[PDB]
Design a protein around this nucleic acid. Structure first.
Length: 51
DNA sequence: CTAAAAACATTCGTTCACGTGAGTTCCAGTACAAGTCTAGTC
DNA sequence: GACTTGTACTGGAACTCACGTGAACGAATGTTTTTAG
């Protein structure tokens, strides 16, 4: 359902960060593995900065 | 009348200036430890 | 106890990066008004 021609701005890269929350890496890896297996992208609401 | 030359209006891209949040690191400022405190005789 | 010298730690500011907002100029196109043939 993700159309290639539906491009707005350059894409970014999201990587796990264990410095702040301990155990986030395991959940991130599991989510990545299962998304790859099931070929599904996670829909999210993004708020880069306050206000 | 007629077309054409000039003027006017619009949208886009690039440039710049300013403001602001986030990450990195460099340094002034602070804290703390150690030494000094006069020179000589008997 | 007061001064001086030397060493170690540390939070704030400088720098950079990236994004958003607003203002200005020129290119290219389209459209309207006016004037000579």
């Amino acid at each position: 359902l993700l159309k290639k021609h539906h491009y707005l701005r350059p894409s970014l890269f999201v990587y796990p960060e264990e410095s702040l929350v301990i155990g986030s890496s395991t959940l991130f890896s599991a989510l990545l593995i299962k998304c790859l297996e099931k070929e599904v992208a996670a829909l999210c609401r993004y708020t880069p900065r306050r206000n």
